[PDB]
Design a protein around this ligand. Structure first.
Ligand SMILES: *[C@@H]1O[C@H](CO)[C@@H](O)[C@H](O)[C@H]1NC(C)=O
Ligand SMILES: *[C@@H]1O[C@H](CO)[C@@H](O)[C@H](O)[C@H]1NC(C)=O
Ligand SMILES: *[C@@H]1O[C@H](CO)[C@@H](O)[C@H](O)[C@H]1NC(C)=O
Ligand SMILES: *[C@@H]1O[C@H](CO)[C@@H](O)[C@H](O)[C@H]1NC(C)=O
Ligand SMILES: *[C@@H]1O[C@H](CO)[C@@H](O)[C@H](O)[C@H]1NC(C)=O
Ligand SMILES: *[C@@H]1O[C@H](CO)[C@@H](O)[C@H](O)[C@H]1NC(C)=O
Ligand SMILES: *[C@@H]1O[C@H](CO)[C@@H](O)[C@H](O)[C@H]1NC(C)=O
Ligand SMILES: *[C@@H]1O[C@H](CO)[C@@H](O)[C@H](O)[C@H]1NC(C)=O
Ligand SMILES: *[C@@H]1O[C@H](CO)[C@@H](O)[C@H](O)[C@H]1NC(C)=O
Ligand SMILES: *[C@@H]1O[C@H](CO)[C@@H](O)[C@H](O)[C@H]1NC(C)=O
Ligand SMILES: *[C@@H]1O[C@H](CO)[C@@H](O)[C@H](O)[C@H]1NC(C)=O
Ligand SMILES: *[C@@H]1O[C@H](CO)[C@@H](O)[C@H](O)[C@H]1NC(C)=O
Ligand SMILES: *[C@@H]1O[C@H](CO)[C@@H](O)[C@H](O)[C@H]1NC(C)=O
Ligand SMILES: *[C@@H]1O[C@H](CO)[C@@H](O)[C@H](O)[C@H]1NC(C)=O
Lengths: 420, 157, 198, 49
């Protein structure tokens, strides 16, 4: 068929009509970002020749490409370590969650470290690790930061986020009861603190339900970590392709160097060695170039991940869709085998209602504009509310300001303004 | 068929018509039944606190269980010449697998940072009473040297 | 080693050029690394065979160097895009992004030149001398719940004040800096107090 | 379409698969770039008459 771009709808746009939500949704979405890849070291002399002195002699008379390839691979490994350090080792102190989990009904046991010691990983981290499944001079250099240390970094970041908000990302951590932290975050997205202080129980229940939906999605729905799996698969495919190319004839009489040496005279043996060296060296050049390109891509992804950690996790971001769809509230990091997972907690408007607006109010031959919010009328009664939530208030001189007469404003209506 | 490696008793079962056995990469693995496993090899790294600070060095053999050949064993391999201390310091020379070295040469596990527990409780906040103006230096390359190479002159001359 | 990044960039470039020069004087499987001796010693068929071999080797070396230069140029371009962005919203303005231009609340920045790069001196605000106070989500007065317009309600043990979030400026609770949004029967943590009406 | 090329390339290796995989990955990446840049919404809104 021809793919459909999405649902087709027409929005009722009028010069005196607005739609304001009367309810909200706390939605938790998951974002996957690769942070690093496997550190592979290739010994060029061992790969091309395989501990044969004569092939090594012909290689060293050929040139110094081996040093260049080793330097490139070493630089790739150090870049991977730096990527891991920059994404994870950001906070200079390891914060510990207090034993009394009094977060005003906001459950966090699914992302907090489990006291039962499952390698000091949260239950979500355990599912993330379990969901992804991971001789010729080819070695795998272990990462500098172990999985437990990465988990401890994530736990410290998460504990600092809960117990201090964004204060610990800008200096010394300052304790906050985590309810006024949510009130501050609501203030950041344009919602007054009264919404939280009226619907705290509902907000906590919705947040726990969203975490549970993430629980079910990670438990049942597979292929949720497609990016990390794709990175691992590409690296494994490239390595396997190099391994397969090790046993190519390249125009020689045999792909086994030892067989050539034990069968053929030194002049013809060395010309066959030259052919094999040319082929294997070209294959290694191709592999190193692809590895460098992939390392650059992974470095860009890790820079993006570090920016997301610093902006979404250590604070509240006003950037649209940078930390999840909707008005971003907070983010929680979770460790992944070769990357990171961001649980973005966001505010989504819902349950909308029609209203009639007016730019200003003409009262006593004067134009009154709202300080913050918008003028809305249901039926024949006029009120002022806030943009992101329907909280009507009586129009009063305190929350409105006067600017000129009501002759130049287009769309102004006649209404009374209460003077207290 | 000539080669270098270690001959080992094989638990795999061959067939009367089969003589050689090759695993992935189409390389010889088992020969008639004896398994061929090449002897241990790997890289050699040197850990030094710099020539001026000291003339002492430690040797790290990566991916080699060097019990066959101050000895420490880590997931990154084995280390010779360093005394294992059970303290926790900031990493100075990154060895790998959460293990670093610092200056006698000692090897330890990385200290992730100062550990403190925020005094988190309801109806309690921490508010600063003073300010600090801090100037932080950040360095970013903007450009590099523009080099032009004439291939005709370079290759031929 | 304060300017270690620029030093690393120029060292990498110098190493690449030095490696190219060294590879120029490599045998590449021929009889000699010099071409004039090949001309003066061999007959035209063997001479052109050795010249072809040297051309192939040097062409491979030059392509390797060019590819490395292209990768490094892409990285430097990314770094320069980052630097231009940092200049754009940290020198030409104030950035609300966390840790983009310094550890702490960024105030302003100063750019300075460098031989092949730029250096930003980020002036940032860092809180210090933290003190512990007793808080409440709202204040109950005349059967009504009062919330601060901006800031937070704190208590020093006996009296309740309202201050700002990033600094301690305690002020008496007043109807001017507080707003009423309901009663005291729904707010968790409500604390009874009086609000001065001027 | 010469059999000698196939004969001399089957022993040369599997570079053709590498190049095809690289080009396929590039093509998939461009499709993803367009998809990410242009499909920021899932509803096709229409301007009122
Ligand atoms: C908002 O939705 C929740 C259920 O999601 C419901 O319990 C609540 O009453 C709604 N709010 C209003 C004002 O109707
Ligand atoms: C949080 O959820 C876990 C299991 O999902 C439960 O054991 C725990 O009691 C919950 N905490 C609170 C405060 O409800
Ligand atoms: C309210 O708005 C919706 C969509 O914005 C529209 O379909 C509906 O007709 C409106 N209702 C009234 C009474 O205008
Ligand atoms: C409009 O809504 C307000 C709610 O504040 C209510 O007091 C008023 O009666 C409503 N007017 C009409 C005409 O429904
Ligand atoms: C909206 O447009 C209509 C024309 O259909 C006009 O009669 C009306 O005065 C306009 N109202 C405002 C507030 O602009
Ligand atoms: C508002 O009232 C004034 C005075 O009664 C009148 O002149 C004007 O036409 C009214 N405006 C509207 C929009 O009804
Ligand atoms: C170490 O540094 C000192 C002074 O900085 C210098 O004289 C010496 O050359 C360096 N290395 C050696 C060989 O000690
Ligand atoms: C080395 O081998 C011994 C026994 O052969 C084993 O106990 C030890 O775990 C190995 N060391 C490592 C981690 O390589
Ligand atoms: C740490 O290591 C030392 C020496 O390796 C050993 O005595 C013991 O396992 C640990 N010592 C202490 C005091 O924990
Ligand atoms: C704040 O610190 C400065 C020095 O940085 C000092 O002069 C001043 O007395 C301090 N203020 C308070 C209230 O302690
Ligand atoms: C009191 O303040 C200190 C520093 O001012 C802070 O670190 C601590 O969390 C606070 N709470 C206590 C000690 O209960
Ligand atoms: C709190 O401060 C007020 C005035 O700032 C003072 O009257 C009162 O004694 C203080 N109480 C304590 C416990 O410090
Ligand atoms: C704080 O929590 C304790 C129990 O942990 C409770 O007794 C107290 O009433 C709470 N105070 C406020 C202001 O929420
Ligand atoms: C606040 O005062 C009202 C009446 O004056 C009383 O019913 C209520 O229990 C008081 N609350 C507290 C926390 O003292």
């Amino acid at each position: 068929y021809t793919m459909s771009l999405g649902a087709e709808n027409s929005v009722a746009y009028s010069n005196n009509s607005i739609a304001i939500p009367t309810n909200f949704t706390i939605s938790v979405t998951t974002e996957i970002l690769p942070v690093s890849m496997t550190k592979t070291s290739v010994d060029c002399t061992m790969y091309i020749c395989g501990d044969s002195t004569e092939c090594s002699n012909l290689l060293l008379q050929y040139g110094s490409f081996c040093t260049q390839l080793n330097r490139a691979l070493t630089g790739i490994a150090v870049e991977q370590d730096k990527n891991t350090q920059e994404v994870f080792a950001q906070v200079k102190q390891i914060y510990k969650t207090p034993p009394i989990k009094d977060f005003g009904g906001f459950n966090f046991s699914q992302i907090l470290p489990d006291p039962s010691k499952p390698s000091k990983r949260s239950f979500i981290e355990d599912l993330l690790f379990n969901k992804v499944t991971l001789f010729n001079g080819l070695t795998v250099l272990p990462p500098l930061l172990t999985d437990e240390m990465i988990a401890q970094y994530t736990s410290a970041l998460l504990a600092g986020t809960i117990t201090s908000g964004w204060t610990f990302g800008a200096g010394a951590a300052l304790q906050i009861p985590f309810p006024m932290q949510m009130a501050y975050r609501f203030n950041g997205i344009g919602v007054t603190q009264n919404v939280l202080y009226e619907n705290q129980k509902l907000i906590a229940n919705q947040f726990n339900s969203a975490i549970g939906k993430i629980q079910d999605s990670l438990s049942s729905t597979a292929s949720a970590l497609g990016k990390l799996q794709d990175v691992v698969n590409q690296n494994a495919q490239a390595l396997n392709t190099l391994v397969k190319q090790l046993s190519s004839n390249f125009g020689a009489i045999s792909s086994v160097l030892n067989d050539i040496l034990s069968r053929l005279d030194p002049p013809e043996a060395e010309v066959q060695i030259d052919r094999l060296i040319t082929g294997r060296l070209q294959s290694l050049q191709t592999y190193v170039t692809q590895q460098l390109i992939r390392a650059a891509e992974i470095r860009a992804s890790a820079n993006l991940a570090a920016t997301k950690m610093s902006e979404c996790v250590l604070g509240q971001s006003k950037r649209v869709d940078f930390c999840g769809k909707g008005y971003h509230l907070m983010s929680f990091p979770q460790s992944a085998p070769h990357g990171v997972v961001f649980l973005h907690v966001t505010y989504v408007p819902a349950q909308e209602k029609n209203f009639t607006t007016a730019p200003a109010i003409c009262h006593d031959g004067k134009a009154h504009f709202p300080r913050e919010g918008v003028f809305v009328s249901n039926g024949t009664h006029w009120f002022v509310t806030q943009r992101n939530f329907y909280e009507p208030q009586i129009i009063t001189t305190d929350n409105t300001f006067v600017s000129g007469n009501c002759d130049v404003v287009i769309g102004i209506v006649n209404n009374t303004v209460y003077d207290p | 068929l000539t080669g270098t490696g270690v001959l080992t008793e094989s638990n795999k079962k061959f067939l009367p018509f089969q003589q050689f056995g090759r695993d992935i990469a189409d390389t010889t693995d088992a020969v008639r039944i004896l398994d061929i496993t090449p002897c241990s090899f790997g890289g050699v790294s040197v850990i030094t606190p710099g020539t001026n600070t000291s003339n002492q060095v430690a040797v790290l053999y990566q991916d080699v269980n060097c019990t066959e050949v101050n000895v420490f064993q880590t997931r990154a391999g084995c280390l010779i010449g360093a005394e294992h201390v059970n303290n926790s310091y900031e990493c100075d020379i990154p060895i790998g697998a959460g293990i670093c070295a610092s200056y006698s040469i000692i090897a330890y596990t990385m200290s992730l940072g100062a550990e403190n527990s925020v005094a988190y409780s309801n109806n309690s906040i921490a508010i600063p009473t003073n300010f600090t103006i801090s100037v932080t230096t950040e360095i970013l390359p903007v450009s590099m040297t523009k080099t032009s190479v004439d291939c005709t002159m370079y290759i031929c001359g």
